[PDB]
Amino acid sequence: MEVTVPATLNVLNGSDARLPCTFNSCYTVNHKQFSLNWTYQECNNCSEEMFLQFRMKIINLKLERFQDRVEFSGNPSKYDVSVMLRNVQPEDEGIYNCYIMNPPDRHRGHGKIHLQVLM
Amino acid sequence: GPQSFVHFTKQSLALIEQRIAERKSKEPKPSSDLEAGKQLPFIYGDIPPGMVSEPLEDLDPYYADKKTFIVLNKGKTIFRFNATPALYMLSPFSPLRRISIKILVHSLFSMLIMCTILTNCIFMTMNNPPDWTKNVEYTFTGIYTFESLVKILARGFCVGEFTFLRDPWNWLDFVVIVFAYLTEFVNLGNVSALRTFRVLRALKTISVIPGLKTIVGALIQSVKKLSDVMILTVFCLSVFALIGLQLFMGNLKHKCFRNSLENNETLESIMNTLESEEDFRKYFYYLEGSKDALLCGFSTDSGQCPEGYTCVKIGRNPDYGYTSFDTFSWAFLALFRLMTQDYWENLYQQTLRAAGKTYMIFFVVVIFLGSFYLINLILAVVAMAYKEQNQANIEEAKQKELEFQQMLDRLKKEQEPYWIKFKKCIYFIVMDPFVDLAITICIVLNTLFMAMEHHPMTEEFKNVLAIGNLVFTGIFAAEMVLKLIAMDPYEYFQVGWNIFDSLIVTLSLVELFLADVEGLSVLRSFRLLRVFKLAKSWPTLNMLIKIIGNSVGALGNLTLVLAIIVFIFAVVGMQLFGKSYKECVCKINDDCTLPRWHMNDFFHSFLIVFRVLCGEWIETMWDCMEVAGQAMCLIVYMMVMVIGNLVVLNLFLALLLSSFSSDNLTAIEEDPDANNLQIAVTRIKKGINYVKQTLREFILKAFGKIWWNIRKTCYKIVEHSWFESFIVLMILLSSGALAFEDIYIERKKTIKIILEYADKIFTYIFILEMLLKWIAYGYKTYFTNAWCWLDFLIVDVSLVTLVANTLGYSDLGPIKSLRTLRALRPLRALSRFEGMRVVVNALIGAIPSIMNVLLVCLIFWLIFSIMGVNLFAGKFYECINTTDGSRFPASQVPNRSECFALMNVSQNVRWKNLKVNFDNVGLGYLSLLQVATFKGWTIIMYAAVDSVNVDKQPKYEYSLYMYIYFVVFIIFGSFFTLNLFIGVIIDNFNQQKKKLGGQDIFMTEEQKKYYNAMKKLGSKKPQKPIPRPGNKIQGCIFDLVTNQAFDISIMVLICLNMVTMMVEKEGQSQHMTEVLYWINVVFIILFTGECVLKLISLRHYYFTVGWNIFDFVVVIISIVGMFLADLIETYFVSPTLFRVIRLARIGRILRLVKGAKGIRTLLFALMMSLPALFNIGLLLFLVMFIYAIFGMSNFAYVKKEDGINDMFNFETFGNSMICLFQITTSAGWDGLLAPILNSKPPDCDPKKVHPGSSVEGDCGNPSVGIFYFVSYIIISFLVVVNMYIAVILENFSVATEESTEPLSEDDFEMFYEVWEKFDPDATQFIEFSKLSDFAAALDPPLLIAKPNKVQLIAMDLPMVSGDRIHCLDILFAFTKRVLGESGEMDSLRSQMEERFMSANPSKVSYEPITTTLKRKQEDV
Amino acid sequence: GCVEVDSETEAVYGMTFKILCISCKRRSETNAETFTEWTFRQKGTEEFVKILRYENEVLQLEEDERFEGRVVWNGSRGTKDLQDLSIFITNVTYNHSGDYECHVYRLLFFENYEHNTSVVKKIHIEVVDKANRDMASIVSEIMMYVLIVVLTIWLVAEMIYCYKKIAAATETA
């Protein structure tokens, strides 16, 4: 599955960071079966923390590390699964992953963004 | 000018520009023998060694002023140029541009470009190229850039008239190179389609391959004749599509909905929350295995929903929703299906199931007009178009030849040990006739010995075949090596057939010695081609060899582009839709595995392009439209249809006419040997006569008036027309009595007894009729007449059935079976209707030819079937699970023994074989018939390409490249045999024509007397211009209604009426329905307005023009339809009647034809064809009827597997004729055959108690099923070929004759006054020498200008005694010059002679002694 | 396939008879657990009383001595999808005359759906002392015979006529 994300995303401290993610799946998005997981790992060999998940609706896990700054910013039926991180902080630097399953499409999609926080 | 060769110099240029200045100061065609691209004329001879490939002064004097110059190739090729400095930089004298031309004109360069193109094609074929292909495409872009730079640097870019860009193909090269540059240096995006654009590289082939430009030009010019016949096909598809839209609008949406919706659900709350085809099934009725609901219908003759299921109209059209009639668009699509007959069986069995069986009439009309008529019009015009070219070219060709001869002639006028002993021995030992007969009988025996293969071959038989092929290889090898040493090895390899034999014996020794286990088709099929050495003697198989040799010969370049096309489309399909499939497979095949026909690989892409070529495009089109959208897929598939089918049709007609040119390719003298076989024939005849004489010698050494009265009586009573009519009445009634014998006959328990007693009465009447004919004609005259024999046979069968019934010996096996032979009773009618009689005796006169061209076909298919049996022989034995029917996965149950173990441990698993497999040459013939008719070929192919071994579970596509076998088979068989066949048929249907004196074959006497007047109607043109009537206002009214303005406005009004009739669609808003009704109201009132205007003006004369009669008919029908449909809508209810009445409005749409001369002439050819088509339709209806009776008789209680539904089931003379009409177009006969072929009771159940009836046993008889279906297919094919010939003859006829009529009376009166000035005595006799001034004294059109004697001798005027001539013969001879050779000539000749003999009985003074030409021949 | 036939309506006393009742399913391919009840009203009485019930290839015959024995199932065998409920009545006595209601009770078994149809067929049965040949038979026979006779008469008439004609002709010359 083709997943389009910026490999590196550079955002100023305090600004809003939209993490763009779209995916080219031919099959129509069935909200009763579509699956999306967004996770966060500090490094390629570090632990992933799921922070948002779609399962027939939007699920925001409200991880303490993000406070209430995470928002969904996509539209699954339009093949957009982007998220928004409001008022970015230096600790938000790291790796963010968009996982995508669009049954009955066989292949799972994976986008990986390296978010860097500028002064 | 043999010495016209001067290097292009600056001095010459100076003279050129000087002459240009002289021309410009004072203000012919280019000679078609000095153009570029052709070959250099011979008058120049060979080129000096230095001058070749160098700027040469332009040789055509046409360009002698322009700044142009030629350079000639070392192969004497011509190349124009422009002497203007290229790009205002490179003079023709700059050594750079010099060597540029040098490198451009060559043969290394064309081969370079062609090789690069071929490599680039090979690289295109890959779908996922590895990394180094980047550098390879770099190299190709490099070569293209360099060659384009060479060309543009040599011939100038555009800075001159003769230049790069003016070359049209060079535009394609420019596009290719610039797109390569962009695609490499911009990374534009969405490259999935950009990458495709580089396929145009493969088109540069056409520019490079010497002599393809002319072929593509030929095809392009062959299209331009499809102007009218495409207007007409769009128009007919549109009219029939509006009809289909009006009848079936939204019909293919009925779905057997449930009836016990709980949870307070309704149809809508459900139809919203319902997505998965596993959930639709819970609420609708899906057949055991299928992916649609069960189309039902509200009427009684449509399908039927099972109990507890109501038929409602909701959901999604059938077949992925693409095919239906909901919108005009889908109507046009479904009708393109039904016209190209491409899997139309499913549209048939879907509408007939939804709308009702009664609507089969619609299909009858569509398939007979739209499928049959259009394909024939196409096949006509291209043919005619193609034929034209041949004549022209061949004419032009021979013309040039003559010039060459004259060209030549002008030049001629200007000139004015014991090893040799053994060799001789053996060369005598190869006795031409006897050893030739030996080789031939051994060839035929080897073939008939290979055909003895079957699937379960006992090892004894197998080793027998082994040693047999051993001995045959030995014999053939021995004789070939003998012939080799008999003559010089060189002389042996000289003759082609010996190369053939040597190649084949080589292959045989190869696989005998090496025992190649990996390949079987390597040898076991190639030893077969020896059967072609029968071409030596067989003068028909030799025609198949000549057709093929043409296909790879003279008419071979054309075939090339076909390959190119079938390649290009192929790779196009692989680049657009390639990734699309694998990405979207889950939609088109629920298993998430690519469908059998994807385009994800080049091979499969070529498969699908071949499939759409052979006329099966629709299923692949649904899949492709599901995945890659309806936008690209329709463009691609319609482009493939049109282009590919056009090229295949031009190829086919090319081979056809080039083989029929047997009259034009007959230039051979007496054969060096008539037939080496015939030598042995004569010699054995000599020997047999010798031994006959000797044995006869040795045998002789060892040893009442009343009776003739009665016969005249009976002759009268049997010729008397009342008797013939009565007999035909009885025949028709007997056929009806047969037709009522359904399966429901036991329910109608009164019709049964009436029909029984009526069968008794009918057999009695026919016995009495037989006796009457006997007493009348006499056994001698009677048994001579064949028709009388068919009557005798059939009435004797009836008599023996009757006596067996009355004796009580019924139910004694055969006798009961004999009752089914009763079904031949309708055939007794074949002799009473002269239409059927004349068609049947035509086809019987044409049988002999198809005997030869079916024997060659049978040998050919036998070759293919043994090739088959060798490859596929019990490798079809899959281990299916019967519950769903899914071949088990080859991972488990690999070898059959495991399939049987699984049977033992489980259920519903059957080591199942196909039913039309290749197990022995018998079933081989059947499956080849299927593959050659594309009906079932798909199942045979799939189960074959999965073959693994003699008994092993077939893997999914373990032997893929055996598809090739089918395609190669298809081609030859279905595209050469047929071709060959068609050849003789036209020749045959030409010879028979010439046999009768140009008469038309398929018409009676009366039909011909009609036909002649129907031809009279065509091109009448005596039409009087109606006079302008006497009234002020009527004045302006007529002035209006006569101008082209008013008529063209009416036409555009009709076109708008069409476009407002097609803009309706299923489910449209109420508002749109009302406004369309009001627009139609306005169109109705406006057309009535123009009719009333024509009436007001033309007065009575309106009803003169036939087209005006049609206008009045349509306007009345239309206002009726309006009012009556209104009354239906308000008073009555039934919608079906309402729509079938409202359908009448399309008359106005039909009214368009008036304007187009082109559309009219076509369908006028149709209406003059309709007689012959009526006779053929009658005969085809007899055959369809006779087969329908057999259907109802023995195929009624067969199982219901596939193509035999609850409907379409041989259970009634209604359903039986449905199915027979289905398979009349050869469609779907595979399916109808499939359930009959069950015999043994794991497939059937021969003790199935049919409820109500009493005929146990529910599986038909295979040996009669295959006979039934193959015979009906072949008869349908012959009758359809007759139809094709009829329509093509009519089309060839209408075009050739164009005619007008001149007539004048005052010309006679001026002829009389000029007669008095030369004949004062009114003796009606004038001197021939004085006629030289007489004929030059008349006024036009009778005036003939001096010299008159040049033409007067050619008129053939008789002369009475005394060098004198009558008045009438001169007046008529002059009359024939102006009026021509019309039918009125000989009629006017009679009336003027009869009026003269009544006034001048003195015949003694009329007797002519000679004519004008014979006397001059006596003078000279 | 299946064909709805109407039973015969008269039985010859002291002999055997077969009461047809064929209730073909609308769509052949589907399957069901058919089981039937036959009830009957003796001509002269007014009540429909059950005589037999046939479910799962066994004929539980009711205790009416009007049918003690004398009847056996002639309907579909060993299928449990009956589709032919005809019974056979050996020994037709005079008490077997009246009306017969053939109740079917189909349970069409579907994808996720069990419809339970009840079709009812009714039959009129007369016990006759002697088989009256059906009116259609004798009418058809008489029609065939008179038609044969009139056809031969017309033919021989036209024959004698044309013969007298051509005879006068041949004797004229």
Ligand SMILES: COCC(CCO[C@H]1CC[C@@]2(C)C(=CC[C@H]3[C@@H]4C[C@@H]5O[C@]6(CC[C@@H](C)CO6)[C@@H](C)[C@@H]5[C@@]4(C)CC[C@@H]32)C1)COC
């Ligand atoms: C050189 O001069 C020849 C001339 C006589 C010409 O006679 C022509 C009569 C029409 C005829 C038979 C001819 C050529 C193409 C033929 C067509 C080719 C197509 O093939 C078919 C059948 C096979 C299909 C595969 C394709 O379609 C037909 C529908 C089409 C066809 C058979 C219709 C009939 C055409 C020959 C005499 O001159 C003195």
Ligand SMILES: CC(C)CCC[C@@H](C)[C@H]1CC[C@H]2[C@@H]3CC=C4C[C@@H](OC(=O)CCC(=O)O)CC[C@]4(C)[C@H]3CC[C@]12C
């Ligand atoms: C002249 C005869 C003998 C051969 C004709 C072959 C053509 C029909 C083939 C060759 C090139 C192919 C074309 C190559 C490129 C395109 C563009 C393609 O559209 C796109 O790629 C859009 C891409 C985008 O929008 O990003 C549609 C198919 C099409 C027309 C193909 C249609 C089929 C074509 C014209």
Ligand SMILES: *[C@@H]1O[C@H](CO)[C@@H](O)[C@H](O)[C@H]1NC(C)=O
């Ligand atoms: C019907 O019943 C009779 C009497 O038992 C029996 O002999 C016959 O075999 C049965 N026939 C059928 C068709 O079942």
Ligand SMILES: *[C@@H]1O[C@H](CO)[C@@H](O)[C@H](O)[C@H]1NC(C)=O
């Ligand atoms: C009917 O006949 C039976 C004998 O078969 C007899 O026992 C019974 O009484 C009769 N019933 C009537 C109402 O006559």
